[PDB]
Amino acid sequence: MIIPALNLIGGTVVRVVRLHQGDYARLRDYGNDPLPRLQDYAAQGAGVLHLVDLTGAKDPAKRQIPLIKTLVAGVNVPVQVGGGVRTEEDVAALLKAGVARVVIASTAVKSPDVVKGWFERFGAQALVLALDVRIDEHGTKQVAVSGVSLEQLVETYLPVGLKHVLCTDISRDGTLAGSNVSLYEEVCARYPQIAFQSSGGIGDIDDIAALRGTGVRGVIVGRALLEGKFTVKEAIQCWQN
Ligand SMILES: NC(=O)c1ncn([C@@H]2O[C@H](COP(=O)(O)O)[C@@H](O)[C@H]2O)c1N/C=N\CC(=O)[C@H](O)[C@H](O)COP(=O)(O)O
């Protein structure tokens, strides 16, 4: 499936650029209109929607639960949400607000003992392991936010039933240069029991086509949709052919 993505800061749909320390900088504001954007995405056939709560990421005390509740209610397609999910209570709050899947990167690589417990409480279908991948000079898929590889972390969670992984090539985020096809070809084949979502870099319709047959189950598209490189409708018809 095609998975359209929005970044949210205090109710605003934003463009950000990832910085060194896991930090980032706000580039563009697209508007204060997340719900109509999501409804248009759904109307065009998007089967899943992706939201990153950057406000909650900075400060979990400020998680945008009331907004998320409204956004989930206002469409009839499942929404997955990430952003500074740190505790079992955070996961529960998001599911209670009507989120279909909770997306977790930082806490999952930092505190595997804790997050394993979440798998056992909520079940594997409720949780998406998000991997912020940096390929180093040696070819290692680094995912720390000492080092941790993609493979090491996937293996960490397979025993508690890991099924969904969002694999972001963070150097590709917002570049419009294409997603990392070879990376997805490799990891999808290595873990055929896992449903990988690709993320970062989609630039034009050819880039969607290029991920067909890689094994990727979901293609996250952010910037290209926001800046009208193509519509959700045509992304879907490319992806489904
Ligand atoms: N500074 C950041 O931007 C950022 N930091 C963490 N995440 C993710 O937040 C989640 C939870 O992280 P954590 O549990 O808080 O550590 C993890 O997945 C982290 O990887 C980010 N992603 C934000 N938007 C991503 C987005 O809108 C589309 O994916 C992107 O525009 C698609 O690429 P494209 O435009 O099409 O090139």
Ligand code: NA
């Ligand atoms: Na689709």
